Design a protein around this ligand. Structure first.
Ligand SMILES: O=C1NC=C(F)[C@H](O)N1
Ligand SMILES: O=C1NC=C(F)[C@H](O)N1
Ligand SMILES: [Fe+3]
Ligand SMILES: [Fe+3]
Lengths: 423, 423
């Protein structure tokens, strides 16, 4: 088995590094003063970048691969998407869900993703998708640590037996309690639904991840209740507010007041660039707002924010290959995080910040941690992002679980020339 | 007595029809293949349009005919109107109210209106107008079925003994429970007032009709509580939200979310075009908003919406002859329902949709129903609307209760020529 990763570059560090492995864990990390020779049991990073695994903090594996079934989301809105999904949800079968979830999970393994948080719609008395996903979680465990969010897609108080079904999902083993306050019939139901969500999370000792204010409504401020309840309960690390796209439309004075609470609360934020740019701004004519939450300001304020893919060929998103560098690319452009350092540091949005969002306890290139790491054939985050590089090797427990032999491009000029798009 | 209505056109139907009458009811409806000859006991529609009676779903008979007494509403706003009305309310007498209400009711009978819902201000310890209106209801019964809404004009929680007076009005016989959440001192009083309104409606088995969000305030969203409470209680058919002019100013994303609840709830909506275009937009300079609720979108979504006159020469409206085709004309223009089919189908907004709003159980040209119908000297809804035709005959219980001999216009050219404005 592998004993060392050599010739590795690490974000924020100068030079090359060697990562020693023992019993499936990282035993030590030592700097190199030059290039080390390869040998059996040594995986050569070849002066590429070594980082802990990519993370998918927000995806819907129960809906993945169902776009157009039985109908397409014509308007490209969150609301029609939920209606189209309702039609598909009525046709779910156990094997259907497992097969589609596994198809996307394999793309994720290929893309160096070893941690995934999937929401699963539990506004369904049969809990068909949840039962299937709980089996998938066990089956995929050797390659991906899958967290399941009990997501009451049609509301907690606004759907028949919504609260009972949400609790049933937790009793069956869901890892995270979800909610969707802006979809509840009234603002009061929205606020009350959050009190119920927090009570369930404390009763069962589970994490929280709310689909929060995913709407271009400047009056949708459920995020302040999520943050205040987390602060009151002293549980910010365990709480996440997904989307918060309404924040894109808030006035600046309220946002400034709010940011103090967001920081004090310690809660996490997920932005979903590919889906947000598509679903938000649909009620504007021109000009049209971008609709992504205030990622740049969160980073400047030290508030933990990260990026998810959200949908992969489903009612809310017709594209995708479950590639986090592609998600990152979209987010950096739409959020205008286009300075060299902002782009280079972008990898944090799909690695460390996402691990914090998932409350991971064994993550990072550090002595004592499990030997879970990936190798990118690039010099730094900027280079990896610019060239949209594949994952050369994905290592888990000290063993290679995925590898990509890069494409080879040649142009035939006066003489053949290899093109790698580098400078 | 009349035995048949012949040569009748019916909305949405081709050709001519004969309506057989027996014992004050419609016994059968049969198609004709040509024009039928007149005879005694046959009322000839003369290829005009026969429809169930016009309906007035929202009027204030306690304030009708009082404009300028003792002062005029100078600003033309809802707020000053309430202040001017307060001055007039202090001068009310039993006979005063009965005489004015009857004057407008006679115009309504002349205009083919056989169903009227009048709001009556019950923010008055003496309940003077209500006592008078309860007598008028009995007196006008042979010609008009009058519903009375106990309307707490100055608020339920924001007026001394408001709730007690509202309940007293129901104990005296008011048919419908009213409310005015946007006029309450606070948003919290507004929401609480709706819980009290619904509790009273369920306690007494009465209908509900709320003056809801009649204000150009994008934050006035009491309509979501009206719809949610109706859905919770399973009583949408019995509930109406009048005005909802704030909806004209909502962002599109919130409106889309809201519409799902509006449809699921089954509640009714009343727009009051003549008054709304006058009272709304008064705080804008230029451009100036129209201020009518989202009638076009409600129709496209299958949400029941209809039109009322609201005021006839009162604090909120200096004009009127209580003519529903005139109300319809204004609404079609301001709401931009100007396509041929939209205009032609406009009659639904002042007939069937309004009957549903009043929860009527005996309405429509159908076998078994009471023989209540009117004849318009026009080819279809479009023609009736374009030419603002009078009601040729109004029939109730199989007897003629009103008739209008149309005006006769002649131009004296090289020879005299009759002009009917038709093509
Ligand atoms: O409520 C939602 N369901 C599914 C999505 F993809 C979107 O994140 N929002
Ligand atoms: O609150 C109100 N009172 C009277 C009117 F005419 C208007 O409908 N609104
Ligand atoms: Fe989502
Ligand atoms: Fe009114």
């Amino acid at each position: 088995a592998l004993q060392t990763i050599i010739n590795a570059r690490l974000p924020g560090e100068e030079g090359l590094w060697q990562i020693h492995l023992q019993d499936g864990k990282i035993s030590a990390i030592d700097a190199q003063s030059g290039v080390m020779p390869i040998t059996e049991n040594s995986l050569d990073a070849e002066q590429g970048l070594v980082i802990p695994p990519f993370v998918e903090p927000h995806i819907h594996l129960d809906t993945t691969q169902t776009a157009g079934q039985p109908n397409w989301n014509q308007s490209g809105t969150l609301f029609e998407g939920i209606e189209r999904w309702a039609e598909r949800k009525a046709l779910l079968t156990h094997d259907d869900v497992k097969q589609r979830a596994w198809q996307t999970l394999k793309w994720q393994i290929a893309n160096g993703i070893q941690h995934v948080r999937t929401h699963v719609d539990v506004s369904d008395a049969t809990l068909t998708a949840l039962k299937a996903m709980l089996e998938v979680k066990q089956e995929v465990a050797p390659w991906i640590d899958l967290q399941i969010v009990a997501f009451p897609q049609e509301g907690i108080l606004s759907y028949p037996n919504g609260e009972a079904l949400l609790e049933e999902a937790l009793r069956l083993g869901a890892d995270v309690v979800g909610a969707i306050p802006h979809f509840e019939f009234t603002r009061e139901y929205g606020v009350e639904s959050l009190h119920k969500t927090f009570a369930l999370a404390q009763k069962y000792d589970r994490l929280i991840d709310v689909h929060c204010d995913e709407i271009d409504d400047e009056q949708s401020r459920f995020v302040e209740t999520v943050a205040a309840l987390a602060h009151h309960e002293g549980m910010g690390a365990r709480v996440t507010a997904s989307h918060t796209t309404a924040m894109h439309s808030y006035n600046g004075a309220y946002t400034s007041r709010l940011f103090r609470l967001l920081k004090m609360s310690g809660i996490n934020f997920v932005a979903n660039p590919l889906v947000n740019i598509h679903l938000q701004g649909r009620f504007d004519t021109y000009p049209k707002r971008r609709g992504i939450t205030r990622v740049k300001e969160m980073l400047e304020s030290g508030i933990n924010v990260c990026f998810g893919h959200d949908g992969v060929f489903d009612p809310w998103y017709p594209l995708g290959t479950a590639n986090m560098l592609q998600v990152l690319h979209m987010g950096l452009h739409v959020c205008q995080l286009m300075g060299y350092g902002q782009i280079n540091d972008g990898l944090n949005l799909i690695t460390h910040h996402s691990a914090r969002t998932l409350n991971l306890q064994d993550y990072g290139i550090a002595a004592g941690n499990s030997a879970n790491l990936i190798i990118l054939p690039a010099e730094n985050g900027f280079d990896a992002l610019r060239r949209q590089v594949p994952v050369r090797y994905s290592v888990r427990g000290g063993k290679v679980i995925a590898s990509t032999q890069p494409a080879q491009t040649t142009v035939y000029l006066e003489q053949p020339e290899a093109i790698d798009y580098k400078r």
